[PDB]
């Protein structure tokens, strides 16, 4: 169905394949390195090839939706009240212990946020967490106070893709959160799709290593799904051409020659 | 007034505005012409003898 858009889609697919492989060494193409994001709205002419990373998660911050000269870091721990893996309870037997607990929790959260900020990071990605609060309201308030754009609920399965895209090494303990663990980027902003939703795009990276994202847009869901399938077909055709460097004529010529 | 339903129905079926036809009919009848009715073969409200 996407044939009037071939002038836009075919160079898009060719570039997408060529930007995820080494032309002089590659013998196969991993199509998982080409992420496809389907967003309802617009027309198929609005399909875009994004060099960097496109995230469907919303920004938890308010008033901070565009960072220039971004320093992105991944967090695989939780910014909430301390909680050990084994069973833990806090026993209060005196009235002073109450506000002592409150103050100490505040100090712990503030120290965590200060340690994160001291590395120069201004965009923070927090992995999705179960059984513990990944991001706390106090932690979110402290991060907002220090002008750090926070995106939480990052899926575990996407960690490898994000690390390959923006060159950010994931951090699981605050003691190992240093400057070199971050990934520099030119721009990380949340764009608006003309009222059809919001997308977070991190375009322009110091080390853009073999990863591209394709954003597919359309009027209705069915045409978007079929456009995605057709783009996948084109990518698979280029993958075949990469695997075996042999071209043949089309339009039934091989079948007629074979029959004769 | 109940006699107006006949020219009104004729005008409605003919596809024109009944009120204009009835107004023209009253005007021409007050003028003194009692043999004037609506013109079927017309695209606009019109009357003829």
């Amino acid at each position: 169905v996407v044939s009037q858009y071939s002038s836009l889609l075919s160079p898009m697919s060719v570039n997408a394949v060529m930007k995820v492989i080494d032309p002089a060494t590659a013998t196969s193409v991993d199509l998982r390195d080409i992420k496809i994001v389907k967003k309802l709205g617009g027309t198929i002419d609005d399909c875009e090839l994004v060099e960097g990373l496109v995230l469907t998660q919303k920004v938890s911050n308010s008033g901070i939706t565009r960072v220039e000269k971004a320093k992105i870091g991944l967090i695989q721990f939780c910014l909430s009240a301390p909680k050990t893996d084994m069973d833990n309870q806090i026993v209060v037997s005196d009235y002073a212990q109450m506000d002592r607990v409150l103050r100490e929790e505040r100090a712990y959260i503030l120290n965590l946020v200060k340690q994160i900020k001291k590395t120069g990071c201004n965009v923070l990605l927090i992995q999705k967490s179960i059984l513990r609060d990944a991001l706390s309201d106090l932690a979110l308030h402290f991060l907002n106070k220090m002008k750090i754009m926070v995106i939480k609920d990052i899926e575990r399965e996407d960690i490898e893709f994000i690390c390959k895209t923006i060159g950010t090494k994931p951090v699981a303990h605050i003691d190992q959160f240093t400057a070199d663990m971050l990934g520099s980027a030119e721009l990380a902003e949340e764009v608006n799709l003309n009222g059809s939703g919001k997308l977070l795009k991190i375009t322009g990276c110091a080390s853009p290593g073999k990863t591209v994202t394709i954003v597919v847009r359309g009027s209705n869901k069915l045409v978007i799904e079929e456009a995605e399938r057709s783009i996948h077909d084109a990518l698979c055709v280029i993958r075949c051409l990469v695997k075996k460097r042999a071209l043949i004529a089309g339009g039934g010529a091989p079948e007629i020659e074979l029959a004769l | 007034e109940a006699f107006e339903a006949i020219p009104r129905a004729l005008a409605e079926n003919s596809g024109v505005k009944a009120n204009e036809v009835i107004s023209k009919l009253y005007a021409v009848h007050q003028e003194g012409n009692k043999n004037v009715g609506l013109d079927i073969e017309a695209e606009v409200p019109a009357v003829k003898d």
């Binding site: 044939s3 309802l40 027309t43 308010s62 109450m98 503030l110 308030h141 209705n220 | 695209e43």
Partner: protein, 536 residues
């Protein structure tokens, strides 16, 4: 049944094509009678007696129960047009259905659907180019009158059409009030920041445009004052209740003497927080969370308002308009618990106003930013809901006109001119793409035809006169001003709609054309339907 052995029903070829066209025509005919100034509203009953008197195409198509896939495609097309533009929701559906009908008529003549799709795509591109190059009017030559005219045009066919002279002024004032510039110097207008409150009572002409913000909320306690002159608004995103320990904290008492102190602290913590908030000088306290009775008493004794369960978006709008800062907690970077006066919004008045046995908060004349709110008064709730829908349509139209500064004449002028131009232009492209583009041009004429039909006038004669005027404009270089001629539905004669003030944003027409063309192509690609039997 047969050699295929598929558990379901299969339709192929002309049968499924006719089914799709029938479904599209049904969807179009549902809303075809609600187009243009001589359109009429509809009642929708929700199987439990709920009544929705509406004229918006998107509302009608969302409320309906639709089963056929092509009908669902048209309904979601209307929804997309509503979301992305806000106007022309009926026109896009009608145009898409007419395009599909004419394309199927071409296909029945053994014209291949690929040729029809290519012709439709070429015709849509050429129509957009012609609209952008010939039929656009820059708003800089008109001024504030253009916005009012566009709003009035959008308010036609709506329950607020006759009172347009007043409603359009209110809409323009609200949209201009909610305007503020951003980075890169692009002044954009955040509609949906105009709070719209519906309250039955007096006539529509007594609807109020608030120079501030309006809350659907009341003061927490009857002992609080119900009017503050120099309001110092404090916006909070936390509850003011008795302090309770988290899951990981337990109170275990081995010496009984500590129980009284612990129980005292449990409320003294919130008491101290409220004491700080009042000591900074705040007069109005708005919080998204709840407020306990003792905290309400604290506010009452302090002589200050306190509103609980405020909606998050309302609180955000109030904080932005008044200069306040939302605080989810009282915690500075020193580890303490403070509240300085720099985080207080200001307003020239906050009043508890009574509207038909219901009370609401009015925040009048917020400083550091202007905000607008609209209160609609009507006979009953259905009328107020339809008024709100029409008001939203008008606000969206005004926003489109202000963002993109080009407008096009209304009343079928654009469609007639496009039909003439595309009918002439089809002869210079292809052999069967000629037929496809000609059918696209003839399908574009459904809008003026529907307008004329809704007025119980001679659609054929009026459309012929309009086409003659536009053809004369296109063929005669010195009669180019005739391209502004549209349809005057009150008198049933062609009229220069640019001079008459019938204006529409160009984005409405362009997006409608693109979306309708894509939907028609999507439906036209189908030539076989397999309907698997449900597993239930």
């Amino acid at each position: 049944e047969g050699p295929l052995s598929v558990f379901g029903d299969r339709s192929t070829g002309e049968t499924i094509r006719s089914q799709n066209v029938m479904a599209a025509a049904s969807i179009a005919n549902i809303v075809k009678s609600s187009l243009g100034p001589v359109g009429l509203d509809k009642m929708l009953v929700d199987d439990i007696g709920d009544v929705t008197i509406t004229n918006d195409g998107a509302t009608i198509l969302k409320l309906l129960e639709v089963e056929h896939p092509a009908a669902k495609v048209l309904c979601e097309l209307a929804d997309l047009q509503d979301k992305e533009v806000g106007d022309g929701t009926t026109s896009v559906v009608i145009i898409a259905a007419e395009l599909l009908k004419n394309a199927d008529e071409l296909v029945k003549q053994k014209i291949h659907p690929t040729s029809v799709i290519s012709g439709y795509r070429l015709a849509c591109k050429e129509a957009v180019r012609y609209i952008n190059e010939n039929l656009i009017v820059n708003t800089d030559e008109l001024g504030r009158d253009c916005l009012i005219n566009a709003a009035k045009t959008s308010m036609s066919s709506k329950i607020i059409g006759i009172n347009g002279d007043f409603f359009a002024n209110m809409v323009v004032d609200a949209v201009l009030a909610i305007k503020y510039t951003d980075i890169r110097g692009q002044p954009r207008y955040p509609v949906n920041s105009v709070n719209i409150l519906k309250a039955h009572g007096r006539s529509q002409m007594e609807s109020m445009l608030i120079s501030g913000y309006a809350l659907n909320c009341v003061v927490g306690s009857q002992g609080m004052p119900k009017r503050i002159v120099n309001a110092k608004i404090a916006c909070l995103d936390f509850s003011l209740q008795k302090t309770k320990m988290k899951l990981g904290v337990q109170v275990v008492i081995t010496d009984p003497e500590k129980l009284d102190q612990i129980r005292q602290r449990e409320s003294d913590i919130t008491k101290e927080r409220i004491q700080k908030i009042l000591a900074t000088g705040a007069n109005v306290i708005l919080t998204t969370g709840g407020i306990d009775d003792m905290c309400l008493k604290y506010f009452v004794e302090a002589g200050a308002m306190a509103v609980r369960r405020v909606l998050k978006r309302d609180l955000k709008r109030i904080a932005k308009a008044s200069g306040a800062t939302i605080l989810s907690t009282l915690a500075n970077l020193e580890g303490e618990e403070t509240f300085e006066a720099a985080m207080l919004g200001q307003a020239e008045e906050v009043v508890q106003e009574r509207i038909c046995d219901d009370e609401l908060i009015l925040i009048k004349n917020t400083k550091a930013r202007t905000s607008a709110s609209i209160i609609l008064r009507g006979a009953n709730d259905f009328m107020c809901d339809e008024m709100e829908r029409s008001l939203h349509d008008a606000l969206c139209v005004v926003k489109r006109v202000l963002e993109s500064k080009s407008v096009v004449p209304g009343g079928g002028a654009v469609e007639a001119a496009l039909s003439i131009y595309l009918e002439n232009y089809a002869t210079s492209m292809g052999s069967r793409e000629q037929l496809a583009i000609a059918e696209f041009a003839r399908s574009l004429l459904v809008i003026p035809n529907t307008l004329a039909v809704n007025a119980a006038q001679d659609s054929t004669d009026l459309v012929a006169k309009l086409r003659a005027f536009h053809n004369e404009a296109q063929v005669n270089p010195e009669r180019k001003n005739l391209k502004w001629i549209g349809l005057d539905l009150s008198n049933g004669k062609p009229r220069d709609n640019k001079q008459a003030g019938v204006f529409e944003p160009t984005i409405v027409k362009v997006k409608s054309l693109k979306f309708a063309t894509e939907a028609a192509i999507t439906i036209l690609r189908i030539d076989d339907l397999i309907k698997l039997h449900p597993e239930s």
